[PDB]
């Protein structure tokens, strides 16, 4: 039943594993150094080992300079005997949690307790050290997975994962903690391998304070990041601002939807503010005659038409085009005529409902390549404009007026 | 005091439990195969159970098959008694760990420790067992939650969590690592019940891969995706690509603002970019003499008006419906004009300060219903443009020119 | 060699510890109430403490209301003693999961269990105690962090962070569980210390319930939330809805891009949708003579301009501001003409490659003050083809038309 030390002046009641090397050498790295653990009963046997324990073992050999020392916690899944338990649990000697459930690693891992030692383990793995030391780890086959259940009760299901951030230290005898500091970020992304190495995040979001806080003032911003084809270092793309601005994080550099990736419409309250300053331009020139001549056949065309239940106002490319040639113009050297072309390509289209095979199943299709030819109407306007223009000059000489 | 295991001739020191089932039988599933526990003094005796402990258990009845077990750590609330102590750390046979602190599961549920064995004791919950064996598993009332704790020290507060996708395995014989594949994808989203079970994601955000990885190149993108009303299945909707482009994930599909949230100016350098192809369209017609005589009559109601202070150029939308009316046409059949309508609502407005209740404190408002009268200015523009075509040309035959 | 411990019977094998306060008084507050603990072999004697333990130990002084009790793994880095080793596990009698690996904390906070412990430790951190009971914590210097690794092997590599969401409760006698109820949310955010203290989340990713849910209907939306400078309350700012619309979270509120940071061109399907309705403006008057003259000049300055390889149509916005002067009109006044400046400002551009430091790091930039002269086309277009108006009117007044 049960067995106990107990200790009735006020000291400690402790139990310790002693352990040497061999020959009275010192412990070594990866030695079990002491253990605890159940063995249960076969009907007139025990197992030969334990199928759930607590080890305590060696980081490097022991010296005068290092007494490591770490931890991990076996089980064995059900319908499985004790060749087959797990190291599922491995507090490293750096202080990191490591989780690696049934399925994850061999069996010769099971010593592996950080990202140095994986990586001995594993020549081609060649993760980043920096990041011991710095929490949890999980590995597991496919889909490691952190799940937040959150019942209701009497509130609202409010499941969060939150980052706080804090000027100073808790590591010093002064422990000072003060406010978020300029260049405080909380990134959400993915490392992977690139065939030699992991190394930096490819793409993530990113909470980023904008700016230094106190107890007035404490913005903010969401930024998305991608990596490009044919690149290695991700970039801001999109992010939304401490006002509240949604905006490209470079200047005239992003777009807003493609040429298979149409946005369906805009609603503005204003006008779109487009910049025509002289100091990014070179001179304006004049038209000459065939474009002033293709500006005024051009607006003849304007009439209405559907798609294949309302009636759009407008004219086709391909009819613009025929008419800026007839007056011997490219009409793609115009800003106002535009052609995009796209290779065939797969998307995630939707996804299928859960299966005994995993929770998240994308369903693919495939967009066929394709091309559009479109108008600039702001800038077309413009260009039937200055038609409109010389035929009202033209009549105005004509009444000498 | 101390108590200790000596091994001096280099071997493991150990402590075993050894435990049978009733008569000499196997041990059974849940039975206490062995534990670890301490007992406080109360001033003259001891507590009757212990207050904190390690407890190794069986998973399921052990065989020639089976030799399973699990862990579990026990703990006691301060202010209460070793009655309401909280298996609050369970590490599952196959591995996962379950945080289960104080206030998440009752007492009855203690010996839970699968989504499988959960769905067993709480036969409505319904959870996809597909999820054990990943990970972690937090259970909280109301909001289980993650905090990263990043004092700056000397450099920034950067808290993070990082996917780290790879090609191969660890878990065989031979281990084997490679480049990051096409169909990598990280998600950060919610699960819920929908009234009969839990199944997959359906509001996340997603980082993914766009393409295989190589030394030189790595690209990715961040959507984000929602379930529709009506619906149980989750679609992309909008992404940042790898080059930076904001775009939707299905073209002409979904739209930027509504009704009742339209954004209030876009900043762009170039002039949109709209579809005008021959081989989306129906044929263009020509206007009719009503439509033309509209167009004119339009033009004269351009001058300048304030909201309610720069002077804007235009007209009103009203106007241009009486005016289409009294030439017989039905204004709404055209694509320049637009009507929306909206319901009353109720929006999160804004974030309550923290209290003694929780954190996040959203504060609701309600929009009232409404409605907008708008035009598509690029197509009034041409609509307005071909009035002006057909006036030019009544002069011109006049003057025999 | 093995000590054990052995129970034939069928009942528990269990270890106890004993321990009192001095003079048997009660134990107290965060005492040893019982260890195991591992001690590795120096050559020829073991180190004086546990270079690998576990701790059972009080949580608040024992009573008769009060059996508080906690637990800590400790553990010792590789190249150093057992001075400096790190109980980097705490499982608090709340219930809650602590990680705190090396560097995080000093050693005389090495009894910290919770939020409240840590407050009352350090006076100035001032997190809110509500926190305490959700989960896991964890704490390190500068970039705390989760890494989910997730071998392909013959599957894809798709890690995942899922909230879970349910109506119910399954910490009663009742355990009742139904569908995902309105308010629903999981927020991916930051707190942060502003000087005080910690308190809400100022900018975040947050999933939420739009509307609840049944078997035929799970609605979601994903909305991005920020923070103002000079405010210290997040609000909702851009959000994917069920429907898949991008938009802002309040009307007539939020810009799209802004003057150093411009949108390059949008991909549109219909025309923008300006809301032009009687209802929300003042009278709409004529144009004086002065401004219809202005209107008429300027569409002479209408041709064709390239940056510093296409042609583009139109003017500059200079050469319109001179054209309006010239009538004596002050051009900014008028919507159609804009003028935007911004101060000097410092950006992350890049994220430089993995180092010895960390592997997320950020490459800076400064963009110049600068300014932008920019047109709204849309209306630019009305104020032109009033011009053009005036002009065919006089035209067909003088041939009695």
């Given at each position: ?10 000291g ?7 352990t ?27 197992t ?9 073992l ?8 290092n007494?490591?020392?770490w ?32 399925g ?17 383990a ?8 920096i990041?011991?030391?710095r ?14 259940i959150a019942?209701?009760?009497?509130g ?18 002064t422990?000072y903690?003060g406010?978020?500091?300029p260049?405080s ?5 993915a ?21 230094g ?5 404490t ?42 990736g149409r ?58 085009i025929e ?10 050297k ?6 995009d ?12 409902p ?10 693919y ?6 091309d ?22 033209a009549i ?6």
């Amino acid at each position: 039943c049960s067995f106990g030390i107990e200790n009735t002046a006020g000291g400690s009641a402790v139990f310790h594993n002693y352990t040497r090397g061999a020959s009275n050498s010192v412990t070594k790295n990866n030695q079990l150094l002491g253990g605890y653990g159940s063995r249960p009963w076969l009907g007139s046997t025990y197992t030969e080992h334990s199928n759930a324990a607590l080890h305590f073992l060696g980081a490097g050999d022991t010296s005068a300079t290092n007494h490591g020392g770490w931890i991990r916690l076996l089980v064995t899944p059900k319908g499985k005997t004790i060749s087959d338990r797990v190291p599922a649990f491995r507090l490293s000697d750096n202080g990191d949690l490591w989780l690696v459930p049934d399925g994850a690693m061999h069996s010769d891992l099971g010593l592996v307790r950080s990202i140095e030692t994986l990586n001995a383990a594993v020549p081609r793995f060649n993760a980043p050290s920096i990041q011991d030391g710095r929490g949890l780890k999980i590995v597991a086959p496919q889909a490691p997975e952190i799940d937040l259940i959150a019942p209701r009760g009497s509130g609202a299901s409010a499941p969060a994962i939150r980052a706080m951030w804090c000027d100073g230290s808790l590591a010093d005898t002064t422990r000072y903690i003060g406010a978020t500091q300029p260049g405080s970020t909380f990134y959400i992304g993915a490392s992977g391998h690139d065939g030699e190495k992991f190394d930096s995040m490819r793409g993530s979001v990113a909470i980023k304070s904008a700016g230094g806080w106190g107890p007035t003032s404490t913005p903010t911003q969401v930024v998305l990041e991608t990596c490009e084809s044919g690149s290695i270092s991700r970039l801001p793309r999109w992010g939304v601002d401490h006002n509240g601005t949604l905006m490209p994080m470079a200047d005239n550099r992003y777009n807003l939807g493609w040429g298979s990736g149409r946005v369906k419409q805009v609603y503005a309250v204003n006008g779109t503010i487009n910049t025509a300053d002289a100091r990014l331009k070179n001179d304006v020139r004049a038209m000459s005659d065939p474009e002033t001549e293709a500006a005024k056949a051009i607006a003849k065309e304007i009439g209405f038409w559907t798609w294949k239940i309302r009636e759009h106002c407008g004219l086709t490319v391909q009819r613009a085009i025929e008419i800026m040639e007839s007056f011997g113009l490219d009409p793609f050297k115009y800003g106002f005529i535009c052609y995009d072309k796209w290779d065939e390509h797969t998307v995630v289209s939707e996804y299928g409902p859960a299966n005994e095979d995993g929770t998240e199943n994308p369903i693919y299709k495939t967009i066929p390549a394709g091309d559009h030819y479109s108008f600039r109407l702001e800038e077309l306007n413009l260009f039937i404009a200055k038609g409109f223009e010389a035929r009202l000059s033209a009549i105005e000489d004509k009444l000498g007026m």
